[PDB]
Amino acid sequence: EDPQLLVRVRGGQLRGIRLKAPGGPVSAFLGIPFAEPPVGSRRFMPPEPKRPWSGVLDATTFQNVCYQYVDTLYPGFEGTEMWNPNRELSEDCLYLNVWTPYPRPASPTPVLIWIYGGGFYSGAASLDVYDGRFLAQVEGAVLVSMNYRVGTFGFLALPGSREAPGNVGLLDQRLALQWVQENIAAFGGDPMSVTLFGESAGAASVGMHILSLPSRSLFHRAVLQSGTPNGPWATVSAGEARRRATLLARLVGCNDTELIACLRTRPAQDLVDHEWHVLPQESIFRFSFVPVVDGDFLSDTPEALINTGDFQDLQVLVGVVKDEGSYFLVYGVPGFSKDNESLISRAQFLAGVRIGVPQASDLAAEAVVLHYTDWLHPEDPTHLRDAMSAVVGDHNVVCPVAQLAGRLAAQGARVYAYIFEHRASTLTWPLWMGVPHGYEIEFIFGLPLDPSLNYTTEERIFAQRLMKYWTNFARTGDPNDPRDSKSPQWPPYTTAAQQYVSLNLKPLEVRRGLRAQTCAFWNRFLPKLLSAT
Amino acid sequence: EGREDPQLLVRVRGGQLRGIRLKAPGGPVSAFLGIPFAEPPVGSRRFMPPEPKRPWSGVLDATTFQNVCYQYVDTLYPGFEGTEMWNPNRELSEDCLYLNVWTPYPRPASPTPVLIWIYGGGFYSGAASLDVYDGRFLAQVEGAVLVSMNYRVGTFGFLALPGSREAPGNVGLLDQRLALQWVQENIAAFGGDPMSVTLFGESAGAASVGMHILSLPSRSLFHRAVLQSGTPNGPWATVSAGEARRRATLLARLVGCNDTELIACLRTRPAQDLVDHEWHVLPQESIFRFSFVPVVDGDFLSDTPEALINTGDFQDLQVLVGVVKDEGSYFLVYGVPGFSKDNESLISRAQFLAGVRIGVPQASDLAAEAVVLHYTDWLHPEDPTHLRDAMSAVVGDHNVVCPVAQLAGRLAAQGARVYAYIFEHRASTLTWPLWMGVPHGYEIEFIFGLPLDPSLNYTTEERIFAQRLMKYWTNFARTGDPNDPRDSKSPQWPPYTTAAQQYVSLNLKPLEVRRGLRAQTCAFWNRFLPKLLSA
Numbered sequence A: 001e002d003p004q005l006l007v008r009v010r011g012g013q014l015r016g017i018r019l020k021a022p023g024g025p026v027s028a029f030l031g032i033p034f035a036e037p038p039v040g041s042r043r044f045m046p047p048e049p050k051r052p053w054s055g056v057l058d059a060t061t062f063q064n065v066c067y068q069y070v071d072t073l074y075p076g077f078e079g080t081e082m083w084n085p086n087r088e089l090s091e092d093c094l095y096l097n098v099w100t101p102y103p104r105p106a107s108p109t110p111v112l113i114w115i116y117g118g119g120f121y122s123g124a125a126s127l128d129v130y131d132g133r134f135l136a137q138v139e140g141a142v143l144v145s146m147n148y149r150v151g152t153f154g155f156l157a158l159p160g161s162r163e164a165p166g167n168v169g170l171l172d173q174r175l176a177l178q179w180v181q182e183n184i185a186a187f188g189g190d191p192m193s194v195t196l197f198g199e200s201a202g203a204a205s206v207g208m209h210i211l212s213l214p215s216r217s218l219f220h221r222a223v224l225q226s227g228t229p230n231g232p233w234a235t236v237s238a239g240e241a242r243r244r245a246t247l248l249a250r251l252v253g254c255n256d257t258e259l260i261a262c263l264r265t266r267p268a269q270d271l272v273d274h275e276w277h278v279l280p281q282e283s284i285f286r287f288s289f290v291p292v293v294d295g296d297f298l299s300d301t302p303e304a305l306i307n308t309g310d311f312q313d314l315q316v317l318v319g320v321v322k323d324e325g326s327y328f329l330v331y332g333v334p335g336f337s338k339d340n341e342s343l344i345s346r347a348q349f350l351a352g353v354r355i356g357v358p359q360a361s362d363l364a365a366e367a368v369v370l371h372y373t374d375w376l377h378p379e380d381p382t383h384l385r386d387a388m389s390a391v392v393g394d395h396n397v398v399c400p401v402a403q404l405a406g407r408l409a410a411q412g413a414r415v416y417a418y419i420f421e422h423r424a425s426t427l428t429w430p431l432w433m434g435v436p437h438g439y440e441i442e443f444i445f446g447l448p449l450d451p452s453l454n455y456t457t458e459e460r461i462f463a464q465r466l467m468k469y470w471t472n473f474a475r476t477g478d479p480n481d482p483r484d485s486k487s488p489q490w491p492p493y494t495t496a497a498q499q500y501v502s503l504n505l506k507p508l509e510v511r512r513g514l515r516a517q518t519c520a521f522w523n524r525f526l527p528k529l530l531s532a533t
Numbered sequence B: 001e002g003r004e005d006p007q008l009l010v011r012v013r014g015g016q017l018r019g020i021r022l023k024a025p026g027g028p029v030s031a032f033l034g035i036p037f038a039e040p041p042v043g044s045r046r047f048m049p050p051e052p053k054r055p056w057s058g059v060l061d062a063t064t065f066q067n068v069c070y071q072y073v074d075t076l077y078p079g080f081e082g083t084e085m086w087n088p089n090r091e092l093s094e095d096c097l098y099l100n101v102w103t104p105y106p107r108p109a110s111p112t113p114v115l116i117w118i119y120g121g122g123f124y125s126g127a128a129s130l131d132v133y134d135g136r137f138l139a140q141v142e143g144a145v146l147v148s149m150n151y152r153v154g155t156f157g158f159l160a161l162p163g164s165r166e167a168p169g170n171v172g173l174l175d176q177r178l179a180l181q182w183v184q185e186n187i188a189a190f191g192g193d194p195m196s197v198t199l200f201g202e203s204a205g206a207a208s209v210g211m212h213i214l215s216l217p218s219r220s221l222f223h224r225a226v227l228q229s230g231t232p233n234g235p236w237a238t239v240s241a242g243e244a245r246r247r248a249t250l251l252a253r254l255v256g257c258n259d260t261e262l263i264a265c266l267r268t269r270p271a272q273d274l275v276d277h278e279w280h281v282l283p284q285e286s287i288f289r290f291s292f293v294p295v296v297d298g299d300f301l302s303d304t305p306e307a308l309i310n311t312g313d314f315q316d317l318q319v320l321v322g323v324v325k326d327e328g329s330y331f332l333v334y335g336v337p338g339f340s341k342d343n344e345s346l347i348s349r350a351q352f353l354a355g356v357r358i359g360v361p362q363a364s365d366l367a368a369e370a371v372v373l374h375y376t377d378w379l380h381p382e383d384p385t386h387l388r389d390a391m392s393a394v395v396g397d398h399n400v401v402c403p404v405a406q407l408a409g410r411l412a413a414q415g416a417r418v419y420a421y422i423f424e425h426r427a428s429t430l431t432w433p434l435w436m437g438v439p440h441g442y443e444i445e446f447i448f449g450l451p452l453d454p455s456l457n458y459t460t461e462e463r464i465f466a467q468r469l470m471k472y473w474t475n476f477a478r479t480g481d482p483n484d485p486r487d488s489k490s491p492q493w494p495p496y497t498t499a500a501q502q503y504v505s506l507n508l509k510p511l512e513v514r515r516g517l518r519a520q521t522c523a524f525w526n527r528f529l530p531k532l533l534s535a
Ligand SMILES: *[C@@H]1O[C@H](CO[C@@H]2O[C@@H](C)[C@@H](O)[C@@H](O)[C@@H]2O)[C@@H](O)[C@H](O)[C@H]1NC(C)=O
Pocket: B337, B338, B339, B340, B342, B343, B344, B345, B346
């Protein structure tokens, strides 16, 4: 019995496991209940705090993954399976994990809270790419990660109802955040320096905590990687959640109370089986059950909230990877695949646009096409393929990111922006996909430091740099290395200068304007074009 | 006769002519100036198509330029060379249907390629007698036969009541065509080859050139064409029949005037009266719009230039087309608040948006907003230098560059051999401010060989470059190909194709080949903007 692996939290005692990191040991406290299991009559309901327990609770192993869809497009291919559930699926899934240095820190240590993505339909804090041991051992960080309910279980809403109020998967997150405030000092964490970080849906979730007042007393800084609360995919209107929830109910054979009661009688896979049948159009980068603009957790649309918000004493780090949209093309757009170069025709490019921008009228999709076509090389298959990925990435990530960055900067936040441009040497997806969505995470988490993983020594050095920016950001709100001099410095992003930096194997480079001309199309013109059909 | 110079006496279908021996830098040229080609379109012949000139008796003196067609005289900058160089330089009269011929001296041994110039001036102005159109250098240096004609402009040339007998419209184009017929019948008398005739013109003249290409009865009268900073397609070069009728009946109201009655009353009006009100009839506050222009009548133009270029067959034709570096700057100072020749014209963002409404007067609010969003630099959305240069570009692109690119593509796709250029050299003698770059019209003195006149103050480099451009223009006239046949060491000028979209820089440096004439931006104007009009 190691005194270092025993912790008394408010609910009772816990026993961790000493793990081996390349540099030395870390303590991990995995599978901690932070809520009552949301099972039975608690399906679709806000989480309740976990009742205290007798004895010493075994926190040496990851808990179950929230009930979700398992990917089937490329069975047994690492590039897809690396995101698939790596534990048993259960609705009993509300647990969090804590890594700390060993011995546990002498003084209060900045806390990093990770919120996974997965389109609000998938994910788990147990995936190898979210391994907290490196950040804990190398940087001295206390690292936290929670499971939150995904899919229908997290986001099925009948707005204004008592029994499916919507946004419960975000309340799961808020609860883990509260758990950290109350409990993290016992692990050596500083609850007075908490930084949220997340990628994709995790980043939009982080963005919703910025925009929801009750969340604001539970963190100090935020990192949003490749996702935003604003934009076309991260929320739905109250009317449209109602539509999709009552559609799913028809599909499984089911007065709000009557309807919800019947949905609660349904086996979990029954919900998942029909989860994708409720989207209004054939689309990609669009998810059925997502946070709803309820007038509660979200008092207005994210767009409204970022336009009028006051972000006085907030610091934010945001960025994108080089090829945000490539990954999504293989899952819906005819002519695209990982098993070849995916060289498309003009006709397939026009069809792909109607799927990547499903909300577009004829005129608006034509404006997209006429903008993304290279008029010197209009029928060139390589250009057309790359433009298709660009449409998807710009519309869904880069331009929302640029819109958020600018509003936050203008409204008194401190913002730092990046583009991640290094393609993992170990990447299993083909070259044409470039640096796809999700593929910065392994570097930020420090995975190249594990020698058995086969990364180059250059990528190990680059990981160490990224871990430093991210933890310097957590410590100080400024990602710059206070010991390093000539770097060059990473400047804050502003609406005037519009400076962001390239994260790649070369030293930092400062660039201005994150797709400025193209994003003006998406953020300024396109709305005016749709709102007159 | 018997005392006169034997080489200056020539007979044409209408009678005997006496010309003048002119001095060009390299030696003498023959010039036959103010040859009447029509009956004076005066009195009851106002607004009427031209009738061929009736034969005269005795020897007609063809030693001085004739009257300039009745027109507006520019007043923005009185005394300023930059504007005055374009103003009438002979008496204004409705009796103006005369043409000019320059040939080598003595006249050429064997039949010589004929170049026919058609002046610009928005269809409301121009004269073939302006200094910048002087044919003496092309004649002397290239051995060229050069013809230029006066045609009617403004209400006199283009006021139409489409369908009427008394004002059918397009008669200014009919003057041009009559002069092309005069060349077929009579140019052999001067050593000119009627089986090798090349039209060239700039701005409205280039539009004119383009309309002879699109008009069947003109096709038998010329063989090759040069369109310089102008096209028959685009937003300014024609109006619909309904719009012409509307403009004609307003002008009529303004001067106090059944179509016969209306026109009979216009014919009783002093020329100056019509001129005094012609600008008063445009539908919006605008620049690069002209009141009285070719009308889509279903006769001279059987359909819109757009319909005809898209569906035409241009098999047996070679075309040279191009643009200057700064097509729009000139137009700004006549109508966009915040722009002047006398300062740097740095404008605010508000002055930009207002200017876009004036430069694109046919645009809805959505369309104007598209233009503003496309041309804004979103790194520096409020920078006054960028906004100034963006404003110029909007106007240049909308009216010239994108119409030209549209034309070149259609023509090339449909049988014609096409060669394309951008003219990027700014005269060392230009009187317009630096900000205006290389304005509309400021290539013409180079094609015409003016720098060769040592009394004009061009650089030696400019003399050499002028000589180069005259070689290209005349090689094109000769052979439908601007490239020197012998000289293979010079860099070549490839044809423009839809596939490769190749064009050349014209500056003091050897030809450089570039690809795509504003391809991204002209997709906005040519492909997207029309569709946003339909909403
Ligand atoms: C540049 O010029 C524009 C036109 O104003 C005219 O020319 C100048 C020299 C004035 O002094 C005035 O006499 C004329 O009406 C102006 O609208 C514009 O403000 C000027 N730009 C600046 C900032 O000087």
